[PDB]
Design a protein around this nucleic acid. Structure first.
Ligand SMILES: [Cl-]
Ligand SMILES: [Cl-]
Ligand SMILES: [Cl-]
Ligand SMILES: [Mg+2]
Ligand SMILES: [Mg+2]
Ligand SMILES: [Mg+2]
Ligand SMILES: [Mg+2]
Ligand SMILES: [Mg+2]
Ligand SMILES: [Mg+2]
Ligand SMILES: [Mg+2]
Ligand SMILES: [Mg+2]
Ligand SMILES: [Mg+2]
Ligand SMILES: [Mg+2]
Ligand SMILES: [Mg+2]
Ligand SMILES: [Mg+2]
Ligand SMILES: [Mg+2]
Ligand SMILES: [Mg+2]
Ligand SMILES: [Mg+2]
Ligand SMILES: [Mg+2]
Ligand code: NA
Ligand code: NA
Ligand code: NA
Ligand code: NA
Ligand code: NA
Ligand code: NA
Ligand code: NA
Ligand code: NA
Ligand code: NA
Ligand code: NA
Ligand code: NA
Ligand code: NA
Ligand code: NA
Lengths: 65, 56, 35, 46, 84, 150
RNA sequence: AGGGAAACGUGAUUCAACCUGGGGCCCAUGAAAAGACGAGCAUAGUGUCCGUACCGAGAACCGACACAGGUGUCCAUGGCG
RNA sequence: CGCUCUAAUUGGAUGGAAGUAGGGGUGAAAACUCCUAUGGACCGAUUAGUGACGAAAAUCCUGGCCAUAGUAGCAGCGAUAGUCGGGUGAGAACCCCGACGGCCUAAUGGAUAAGGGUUCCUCAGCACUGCUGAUCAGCUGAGGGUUAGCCGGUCCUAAGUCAUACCGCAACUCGACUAUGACGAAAUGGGAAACGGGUUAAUAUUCCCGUGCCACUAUGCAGUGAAAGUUGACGCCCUGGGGU
RNA sequence: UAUGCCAGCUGGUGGAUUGCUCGGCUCAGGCGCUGAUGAAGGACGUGCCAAGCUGCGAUAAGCCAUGGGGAGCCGCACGGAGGCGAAGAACCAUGGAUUUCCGAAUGAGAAUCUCUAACAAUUGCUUCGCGCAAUGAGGAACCCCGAGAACUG
């Protein structure tokens, strides 16, 4: 959602990898918050993070990195 | 020493196991042959026409 | 001592949260807050 | 008996599958975990 | 490709290992060696990992007890890693 | 489960039941047959006594091998089913409670109707010799009670 | 160093273990391979992976059962007798 | 006569069908029909067709249920065991504390192999399981726990196994030999290295404190010897000495 | 009049009957190969909470493009919380991406793990270098070549 495909294609092979290691981390910091019986969660995003990263990896494929 | 109950005691040997190839507990870790799929014996899947009635 | 958390402090003794034995919980793990 | 990594991983799943059907599901389906296995009454493979 | 650090293992014993011994417990991908375990933890959190102890849980996942250097503080690191 | 097999006038009646109780269905009949027509109170004091072992219950039907009792009037064999009696006291305590709450004088009311019905067995298996297993079930009982102004 | 509330012993006999010898027997003559030694010292770095809970039995194993059955090894030097 | 479904002709039904319970009538009879309650949605008649078509019987099959019976067993074993106070609890003959009284001494003690598989710890329970009860549990529910260069596996080779080749076979997932390779010992074979103390609800020669050891590699010095030999590396009986 | 016999009435037990059918059974038309560009099958994962199934494969009940579609949606699964959608989702068709391990299983070993670069084995071509290729297995039966009973009559 917050991250649309178009926006991903309007990135540079660098921006993608950067945006990538950024999501990967927001992901980790959610799994952490959840691993600690944390309730400040919002299941609607820890799901998106995965998807987001999916797309990004999907684009990296198409664009040839 | 009766062959019934009494002789059931020593039965603490491991033989048949979760075959790596099929997923059935038929891998005889002693012969290393799957009584179910033929793994370890045949590269082809163990099968027989008698595992079903003659006209079926 | 705490007029903002005495109702949060005096909880740790009766919280039984996942992974932690009654009363042996780090207060900032009990950092979960409502009200 | 000495188990192996692969084995352990399975005993593990097995143990995992041995939990009850969560309450929330019960309501979400407006109404049993047939795969319930006791460590003594039942026998697992291998 | 798979990722090493899966998440922080927070339970009583975990904390005590942090508070009194300066170690941090995570759940890692079982194909991860102690070494791989280290480097990853160092790169993600900016710390120097001295020792890493590993156990293959009855959960199918691997647990890792990673001790930091007296220069770093688990309690503090743990604050940045969700947890606290 | 059952239902009140007897029509009851709400203006002068008080109902009460027991559900899938695990007790001797055979004792329940005896006790019922024995406390019918009695005053809820006389009924309690009776059971309590039975429980104590001072007053026996006439086992007229399921008496096989039962030992004769001196205090049994007009009959011989009898016992002291306590568990059953307790279950029956409860049945009354609710019966007497419901009454009072409606304005009636519980204790003083008569047991117009009471009857035990076997609503089923809680199946169980019993290992036997030669490697065979024989049924080994627990009786599940229901019982009704209807009080009426004297 | 540690441990003990404290004292924080000395000698003795018989001595499992463990060490090392002598003797006798066989129409029985009692494994192998990897490895070690032969072939020193200082400092530093490295030592990955897998097992590691508990039962181990007149209730946690086999015997359909919390089955008076069956099931291997070590403690064979606790006192009296 | 009655049953299923199809066709033609022709009817009934939520102003209540089928079925079911009780009751009335007809037919010699198979059986038809009506009434009342129930039910709450389908149901017939005639003709022509159809057929996995009519059971009281097979030590018939499957399900249910009664008597048996509140009966047999919960005694019989060289391990006859409990008792009095008290704790908790809605509830305590058997859950826990104390005392008194016993039971087990190659085992009813301690450590393990296989096997089991989380049965381990904690909290919360008692509808299930527990030969009675249970506030207990190896039960149920929710959380947690198994941290090793120096304990094992890993390596080695044993009887013996497999794979590839070669050959045989109609042929193979079959088959003896010969070669090459690999596999084959977690108490109980051989085997480079760790001890003591402390610590947890549960791990522990694995974590923490102290101290020690081993292998490889690198750097530095010493050495040019290094391959012969020794060890690993071993039957049974008797016995002396050393010695904790 | 105990114990009790026969029929019924009220309730129970039980699951027959009638009605129903998200499943079967049989027939008919269409269509029909997959695999070393590693299948078919299995293992283990994959959801906010997720045990079964289905789907998927560490991009894990999903990613992308084009067409269809439409205000709705987040599988079976009618919970609690949160979220996605006119930056036109859900859903459908086609093409693409990803696609863990075991598995013919092919570097080597192994009960789905592990040990130090691989067409393992057998072939053809051959720059005689695994350089270029092949075989290996699956499939409801059908089909072809071989080996070939006995009960029974
Ligand atoms: Cl009965
Ligand atoms: Cl001598
Ligand atoms: Cl071990
Ligand atoms: Mg025999
Ligand atoms: Mg380890
Ligand atoms: Mg008698
Ligand atoms: Mg038996
Ligand atoms: Mg242990
Ligand atoms: Mg016992
Ligand atoms: Mg007509
Ligand atoms: Mg009798
Ligand atoms: Mg005695
Ligand atoms: Mg569990
Ligand atoms: Mg316990
Ligand atoms: Mg408790
Ligand atoms: Mg070997
Ligand atoms: Mg050894
Ligand atoms: Mg323990
Ligand atoms: Mg291979
Ligand atoms: Na987890
Ligand atoms: Na078992
Ligand atoms: Na009688
Ligand atoms: Na009398
Ligand atoms: Na009398
Ligand atoms: Na002695
Ligand atoms: Na028939
Ligand atoms: Na008891
Ligand atoms: Na087709
Ligand atoms: Na699920
Ligand atoms: Na696919
Ligand atoms: Na090939
Ligand atoms: Na070549």
């Amino acid at each position: 959602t917050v991250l649309h495909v178009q926006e991903i294609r309007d990135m540079t092979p660098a921006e993608r990898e950067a945006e990538l290691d950024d999501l990967k981390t927001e992901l980790l910091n959610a799994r952490a918050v959840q691993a600690a019986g944390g309730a400040p969660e919002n299941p609607g995003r820890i799901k998106e993070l995965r998807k987001a990263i999916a797309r990004i990896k999907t684009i990296q494929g198409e664009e040839g990195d | 020493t009766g062959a019934g109950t009494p002789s059931q005691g020593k039965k603490n040997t491991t033989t048949h196991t979760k075959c790596r190839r099929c997923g059935e507990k038929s891998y005889h870790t002693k012969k290393k042959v799957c009584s179910s799929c033929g793994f370890g014996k045949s590269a082809k899947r163990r099968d027989y026409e008698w595992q079903s009635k003659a006209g079926e | 001592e705490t007029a903002v958390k005495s109702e949060l402090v005096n909880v740790a003794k009766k919280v039984r949260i996942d992974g932690f034995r009654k009363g042996k919980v780090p207060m900032n793990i009990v950092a979960q807050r409502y009200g | 008996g000495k188990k192996s990594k692969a084995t352990k991983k399975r005993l593990a799943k097995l143990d995992n599958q041995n939990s009850r059907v969560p309450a929330w599901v019960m309501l979400k389906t407006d109404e049993r975990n047939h795969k319930r296995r006791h460590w003594r009454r039942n026998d697992t493979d291998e | 490709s798979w990722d090493v650090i899966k998440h922080p293992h927070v339970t009583e014993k975990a904390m005590n290992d942090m508070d009194f011994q300066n170690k941090l417990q995570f759940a890692v991908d079982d194909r991860a060696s102690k070494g791989e375990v280290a480097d990853a933890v160092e790169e993600q959190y900016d710390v120097t990992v001295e020792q890493v102890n590993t156990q293959n849980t009855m959960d199918g996942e691997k647990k890792a007890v990673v001790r930091l250097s007296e220069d770093d503080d688990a309690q503090e690191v743990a604050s940045r890693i969700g947890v606290f | 489960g059952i239902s009140y097999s007897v029509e009851a006038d709400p203006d002068t009646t008080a109902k009460a039941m027991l559900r899938e109780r695990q007790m001797s269905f055979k004792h329940s009949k005896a006790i019922a047959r024995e406390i019918k027509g009695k005053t809820a109170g006389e009924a309690v004091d009776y059971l309590e006594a039975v429980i104590e072992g001072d007053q026996p219950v006439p086992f007229k039907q399921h008496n096989s091998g039962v030992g004769h009792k001196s205090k049994v009037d007009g009959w011989d064999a009898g016992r002291y089913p306590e568990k059953a009696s307790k279950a029956f006291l409860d049945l009354l305590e609710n019966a007497v409670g419901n009454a009072d709450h409606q304005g009636f004088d519980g204790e003083a009311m008569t047991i117009k109707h009471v009857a035990a019905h076997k609503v089923g067995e809680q199946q169980g298996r019993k290992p036997r010799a030669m490697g065979r297993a024989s049924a080994w079930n627990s009786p599940q009982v229901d019982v009704e009670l209807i009080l009426e102004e004297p």
